[PDB]
Amino acid sequence: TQHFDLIAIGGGSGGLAVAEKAAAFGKRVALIESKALGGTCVNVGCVPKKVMWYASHLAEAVRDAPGFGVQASGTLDWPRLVAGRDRYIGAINSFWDGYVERLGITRVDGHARFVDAHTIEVEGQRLSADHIVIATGGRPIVPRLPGAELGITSDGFFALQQQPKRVAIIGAGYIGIELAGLLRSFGSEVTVVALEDRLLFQFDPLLSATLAENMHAQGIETHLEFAVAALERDAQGTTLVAQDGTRLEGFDSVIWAVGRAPNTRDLGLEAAGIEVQSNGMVPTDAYQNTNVPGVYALGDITGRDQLTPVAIAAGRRLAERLFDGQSERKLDYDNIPTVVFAHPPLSKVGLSEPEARERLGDVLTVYETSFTPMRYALNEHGPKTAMKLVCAGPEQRVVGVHVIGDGADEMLQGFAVAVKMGATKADFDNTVAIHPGSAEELVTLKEPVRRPG
Template sequence: MAYDYDLFVIGAGSGGLASSKRAASYGAKVAIAENDLVGGTCVIRGCVPKKLMVYASHFSHYYKDALGYGWSEVEPSFDWKKLVDVVDKEVRRLSELHISFLEKAGVELIRGYAKFIDPHTLEVGDRKVTADKILIATGGHPVKPQIPGIEHSISSDDMFLLTEKPQRFAVWGGGYIGVEFASILKGLGSEVTQIIRRDWILRGFDQDIRSNIQDGMSKHGVNFLTNTTIEKIEKTDEGLKLILTGEHAEKPLIVDQLLCATGRKPNLGKLMLENAGVEMNQDAIAVTLDSQTSQPHIYAVGDCTDRVNLTPVAIAEGRAFADTEYGHLPQSISHENIATAVFSQPEAATIGMSEEQAKEKFGEAIKCYTARFRPLFHSLTGADEKVFMKLIVETNTDRVLGAHMVGKDSAELIQGIAIAVSMGATKKDFDRTMGIHPTSGEEFVTMR
């Protein structure tokens, strides 16, 4: 049978863009469907605009830090509307740039939602298309718990659309999205409360990372309500009244804005996967290690598969699919030893196993090396800022299983450390490496 396209990609986010351009480079006839701005969550309402807001939130500290270095005191002012406008302008510039990249690669962009008619046929608007192979890369979306008044809360998607900065801001949820936005708003001058169901934020991270971030955020002025959740939200003349349950149930919390950051789910609602016979794994698309679905010609990558929901992972999965299917260069992606960062204040980054995971796998045959110190930058600022570093080593092989850091420039430092950990470096390899002095990074090669 002759098809309209060799490959049809649903979703022009990180995974879809990467796979479509790579497949086209091998000579495949490729189209990609997108109903929103091109770029996906990362470019439009995730990594990029959020990181720009992170940068903006740092300046309040820089003004104070400068005093210790002899700079005169200033009275800065902050314009929320200007920040939102320039971030939106940059997002739209990047989206147009991605469109131009598709054009240069020879990928046809079709505007609209794509849904399955049958395993090889899709409908996009009033157009029907057929494809030999189909790749689903629709990403994820935030979800909210169904409690009374939840419509008065916002999701992470809405954070970049607020017309005014909330003076009293609450975050419900202890994942990295909630942690980052709590830090951003605090840095921009809001009064911030973070409500979490457990004792500590960032479930699944190394416990030392969790405690050092949470303690650092508390020092910066974020108020944590631990072992607490929200039962009901009421809109009043004073603001949003949050009725709480748990340790802090005695008094409602009044805020101007509530960010609900309690979870995300794959974005599959309009695809009509049942028409294609694609099987699900709970809320996500079920895939094999090479991203193949239950239909041998249909593949899925990125957050819609709910494996590891990170932009670089979606890109790697998408390129591996294209290399394998169209470049005849079989590729497989390992979902182990994936470096990640939390752009909180203080910042954190990690690669490899947590101490808890290492103990579960290797028992007592591990050793942890840690360092905690004031970075040189803050020796003159007077700020109570610390850097925490940790290496987890398997004693039988001396292999470094995990590296973790909390403090300034964590993400930049761990990116380099990730190469060593991924290559199977040993503690002796770290010890033999000369440090760059004076830097925080040298502590990774001087721990004893």
């Protein structure tokens, strides 16, 4: 009750990771979870998203099969997809429940709040530890706009027991785009709106442009620089009213996909004297330390890369640092690879061209290519893959790799290793190609499209 080496607040990606490594170094660990182990990723995030992504991937494959001479009819049993998805997620949840007990971790059910710098209270029970790690994650934002409650979030999406016929998605970051692709692939009408002048604004403009092309060809309708002012009920759905009065209208499902807020609202951060930003993010140093000794934060609430393996690595490294004498141990937050699971997917590691220009000079040599992979050889209008290599300095060190198209979801993990090693263009070009496939295009880029100046 005060003899814990560690309290991890939150049994999500970060919390599980720190608790597991700490328990593995023989430490006495308490883990607090108000909902389900696995957090957002397992229950309402990565896993259910990717399972549904496989279904839309197979639906595309059935559409494309006749072109290759493979007989295939062609329609989604949404209830069946949800049933198999939840069974799959359930088993992952059950694994973590059993594993947390196998590790000897003290599981505490309920919502934790700090009471002071080294103590939390959960449903009236106070607990202290030498180390308290905050990993409470986030939740979808619903803007404070008229009729906003007529909309649903990604949480409500994964709760849908039937497929909606006519979807409006508000926001074109990861989840907006991912959900758009899933739903349109299942044959829903899909419109996405976004405040920005292009989809996936945080990504390289070549990826935004090619994604826009692929989505248009899929029959997804898009509205750019479209600011939602309100939602209103019409006959047969809800409408979407823009700042300028434009009405969209008729959607049986409107999904808010406009970001995530950190679960730090009543965590008793004030009581413990822990610094927090107006946006609810908890500042940390490179070693996940808050301003209060013995208090750490990781995962989504730290305001850095909002990804599960970032939460996990940050957690594992912290436990190595605190409990295994590895005093210099920390996560490098540069060159973290990611995939956006559009149809076809995209992936990147490092800097987009404009980011690279912002952080570095015009020292940029940029290589790119577009092509139709052999995956669509015997189809009429397959999506074109696009790739960009962002290189910097006279030695053309690779500072960004960007890909959208078939196979992109498994392509870049190894390129992330090379980039973290400081690969140059020479390192890339001296690597023999694998043929035939798409990844070879990344090591056989010849003429740059842009050079310094």
